[PDB]
Design a protein around this motif. Structure first.
Motif, PDB file in Angstrom:
ATOM      1  N   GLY A  36       0.791  -1.220   0.000  1.00 27.97           N
ATOM      2  CA  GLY A  36       0.000   0.000   0.000  1.00 27.97           C
ATOM      3  C   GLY A  36       0.823   1.269   0.000  1.00 27.97           C
ATOM      4  N   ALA A  37       0.572   2.154  -0.963  1.00 24.20           N
ATOM      5  CA  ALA A  37       1.476   3.285  -1.154  1.00 24.20           C
ATOM      6  C   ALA A  37       1.431   4.264   0.014  1.00 24.20           C
ATOM      7  CB  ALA A  37       1.150   4.022  -2.446  1.00 24.20           C
ATOM      8  N   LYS A  38       0.287   4.385   0.686  1.00 20.85           N
ATOM      9  CA  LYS A  38       0.119   5.334   1.783  1.00 20.85           C
ATOM     10  C   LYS A  38       0.405   4.751   3.169  1.00 20.85           C
ATOM     11  CE  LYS A  38      -2.344   8.028   4.655  1.00 20.85           C
ATOM     12  NZ  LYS A  38      -3.416   7.936   5.677  1.00 20.85           N
ATOM     13  N   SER A  39      -0.055   3.529   3.448  1.00 19.67           N
ATOM     14  CA  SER A  39       0.064   2.941   4.774  1.00 19.67           C
ATOM     15  C   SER A  39       1.203   1.945   4.886  1.00 19.67           C
ATOM     16  CB  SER A  39      -1.234   2.233   5.169  1.00 19.67           C
ATOM     17  OG  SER A  39      -1.305   0.952   4.577  1.00 19.67           O
ATOM     18  N   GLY A  40       1.657   1.369   3.783  1.00 18.69           N
ATOM     19  CA  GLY A  40       2.725   0.396   3.835  1.00 18.69           C
ATOM     20  C   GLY A  40       2.280  -1.027   4.061  1.00 18.69           C
ATOM     21  N   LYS A  41       0.971  -1.257   4.180  1.00 25.80           N
ATOM     22  CA  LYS A  41       0.415  -2.567   4.481  1.00 25.80           C
ATOM     23  C   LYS A  41       0.481  -3.446   3.243  1.00 25.80           C
ATOM     24  CE  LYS A  41      -4.239  -4.536   5.380  1.00 25.80           C
ATOM     25  NZ  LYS A  41      -5.596  -4.300   5.981  1.00 25.80           N
ATOM     26  N   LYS A  42       0.799  -4.725   3.453  1.00 20.97           N
ATOM     27  CA  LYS A  42       0.988  -5.663   2.357  1.00 20.97           C
ATOM     28  C   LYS A  42      -0.339  -6.281   1.944  1.00 20.97           C
ATOM     29  CE  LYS A  42       5.158  -6.399   4.758  1.00 20.97           C
ATOM     30  NZ  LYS A  42       5.261  -6.899   6.175  1.00 20.97           N
TER      31      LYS A  42
ATOM     32  N   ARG B   8      -0.948   8.792  -3.716  1.00 23.78           N
ATOM     33  CA  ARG B   8      -0.571   7.606  -2.964  1.00 23.78           C
ATOM     34  C   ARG B   8      -1.737   7.042  -2.154  1.00 23.78           C
ATOM     35  NH1 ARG B   8       5.604   7.676  -0.876  1.00 23.78           N
ATOM     36  NH2 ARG B   8       6.455   9.322  -2.237  1.00 23.78           N
ATOM     37  N   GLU B  12      -4.154   3.191  -3.044  1.00 26.19           N
ATOM     38  CA  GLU B  12      -4.327   2.225  -1.967  1.00 26.19           C
ATOM     39  C   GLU B  12      -5.801   2.005  -1.668  1.00 26.19           C
ATOM     40  OE1 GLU B  12      -1.808   2.782   1.272  1.00 26.19           O
ATOM     41  OE2 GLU B  12      -2.728   1.294   2.577  1.00 26.19           O
ATOM     42  N   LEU B  15      -7.069  -0.420  -4.208  1.00 26.58           N
ATOM     43  CA  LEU B  15      -6.592  -1.726  -3.782  1.00 26.58           C
ATOM     44  C   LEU B  15      -7.477  -2.301  -2.675  1.00 26.58           C
ATOM     45  CD1 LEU B  15      -4.280  -3.864  -3.752  1.00 26.58           C
ATOM     46  CD2 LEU B  15      -2.947  -2.330  -2.354  1.00 26.58           C
TER      47      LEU B  15
END
Lengths: 134, 135
Positions: A36-42, B8, B12, B15
């Motif tokens: 995830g580009a904002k939170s970093g979650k996979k 960004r 997400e 997604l």
């Protein structure tokens, strides 16, 4: 208890089919991890295995529905992607959207691995994006 | 709020909307099966080719032509409770059941229909590739 003896071996085996402890992968499918580009979650993305020389391809179809898959835009913002293929892990690789000759080369590999990809293409004017990883 | 971060964030957001558990993005021709560790109860996740009929699915316990069982085979027998995620649909806590004789051949036809190389797999080994129904 010997009831647990066998339970404990059953899971032991289930574990040996993971490289992370959660995902059990077999051909013809591989697992792509995207962040995830904002939170970093996979998030985890199972796709058809399309491989050459240790590189893989992500075909960004959505099962014939012409909408992009939900991972498409994220993988473009954050190209860092990890691969699981059976008992092998290629961590923190880089996704790159293909074009021109190279895209076609991997689109032929994709049709070779999953022919109905070509039937997906027949259902939209738009060329189906293909990512190479590495 | 910065445009960069607006981009960004939104992507997400798209997604996350493609998921139903927050982490698994599934599109045809693939579905996800969730299996529970027999001893520990831990979830394991098994992506397989989508073989479906009338809301029921099939797990084809092949290993890409390698004659060894896939590691989820015995655990799905020990603990039959399985959930399936297909696109934006979730069918929780269904029952996996190993098929025999008449019923297995029906679903093996559907499986070869969906993924013909399944038949090539069966050509590489003398043991019958088990097939589960999830119902």
């Amino acid at each position: 208890s010997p009831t647990d003896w066998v339970r404990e071996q059953t899971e032991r085996i289930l574990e040996q089919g993971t490289t992370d402890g959660v995902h059990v992968l077999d051909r013809p499918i591989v697992l792509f991890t995207t962040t995830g580009a904002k939170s970093g979650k996979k998030r985890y993305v199972p796709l058809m295995r399309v491989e050459e020389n240790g590189k893989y391809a992500m075909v960004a179809s959505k099962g014939g529905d012409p909408k992009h898959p939900s991972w498409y835009f994220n993988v473009k913002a954050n190209p860092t992607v990890s691969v699981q293929d059976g008992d092998k892990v290629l961590p923190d690789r880089t996704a790159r959207e293909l074009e021109g000759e190279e895209r076609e080369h991997w689109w032929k590999l994709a049709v070779e691995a999953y022919p109905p990809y070509a039937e997906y293409q027949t259902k939209t004017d738009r060329l189906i994006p293909v990512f190479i990883v590495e």
